[PDB]
RNA sequence: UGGAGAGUUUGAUCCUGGCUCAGGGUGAACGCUGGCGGCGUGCCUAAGACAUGCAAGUCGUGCGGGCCGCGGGGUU
């Protein structure tokens, strides 16, 4: 019902008297490839617990993507922190052209052909959040005319 | 009908930031190796110095001859 794929897994460390103590953080995307995505970042003392927790958080934070023939309706440009994401629709037969993080996010959303570009900071966390906010800032012609009814 | 990023400053993080790599290209060279064909291509340096051969001539339907040779005439 729901497909799940992790973006990256890292091991952070705090300092305590006697040595460093580790804590694992993991990004997880979940999607049905129908137009719904979810992104979660889980932290746990061990890796599998962190992956499961990131999956829970990703299912809790969902985004409805307005797909139009497997591509995006209009080009977007999002600044999350110092990271920038540039999304642009593409004609079918092109394929998802993106870095690992946006490729995974958009593929789990049900996108087949799109042109992206990461700018500024390449940080996978900020890039993931920028792509999520980009998909959250998408509008359709129906929504546009819905706003301009008056 | 058109756009992918990654490694690296820290105990860990975010940012700035340089360096490096994956791509394509070449009148290329070098190493190891090396079977055939087609089409291209081949002094990027000393515009340094050059043996040798060839590479710019042709018209007797513009003109008079030289040399060598043959034939026929004016003459016993
Ligand atoms: K902003
Ligand atoms: K690191
Ligand atoms: Mg929507
Ligand atoms: Mg900025
Ligand atoms: Mg930068
Ligand atoms: Mg860098
Ligand atoms: Mg320092
Ligand atoms: Mg270190
Ligand atoms: Mg410190
Ligand atoms: Mg190269
Ligand atoms: Mg190369
Ligand atoms: Mg040989
Ligand atoms: Mg040949
Ligand atoms: Mg030749
Ligand atoms: Mg040259
Ligand atoms: Mg020369
Ligand atoms: Mg005679
Ligand atoms: Mg007589």
Swiss-Prot record:
Residues 2-65 form the S5 DRBM domain. Keywords: Ribonucleoprotein, Ribosomal protein, RNA-binding, rRNA-binding. Gene3D superfamilies: 3.30.160.20, 3.30.230.10. Disulfide bonds: none annotated. Pfam families: Ribosomal_S5, Ribosomal_S5_C. GO terms for cellular component: small ribosomal subunit. InterPro entries: Ribosomal_Su5_D2-typ_SF, Ribosomal_uS5, Ribosomal_uS5_bac-type, Ribosomal_uS5_C, Ribosomal_uS5_N, Ribosomal_uS5_N_CS, Ribsml_uS5_D2-typ_fold_subgr. SUPFAM superfamilies: dsRNA-binding domain-like, Ribosomal protein S5 domain 2-like. One of its GO terms (biological process) is translation. The N-terminal domain interacts with the head of the 30S subunit; the C-terminal domain interacts with the body and contacts protein S4. The interaction surface between S4 and S5 is involved in control of translational fidelity. Part of the 30S ribosomal subunit. Contacts proteins S4 and S8. PANTHER family: MITOCHONDRIAL RIBOSOMAL PROTEIN S5 (PTHR48277:SF1). This is Small ribosomal subunit protein uS5.
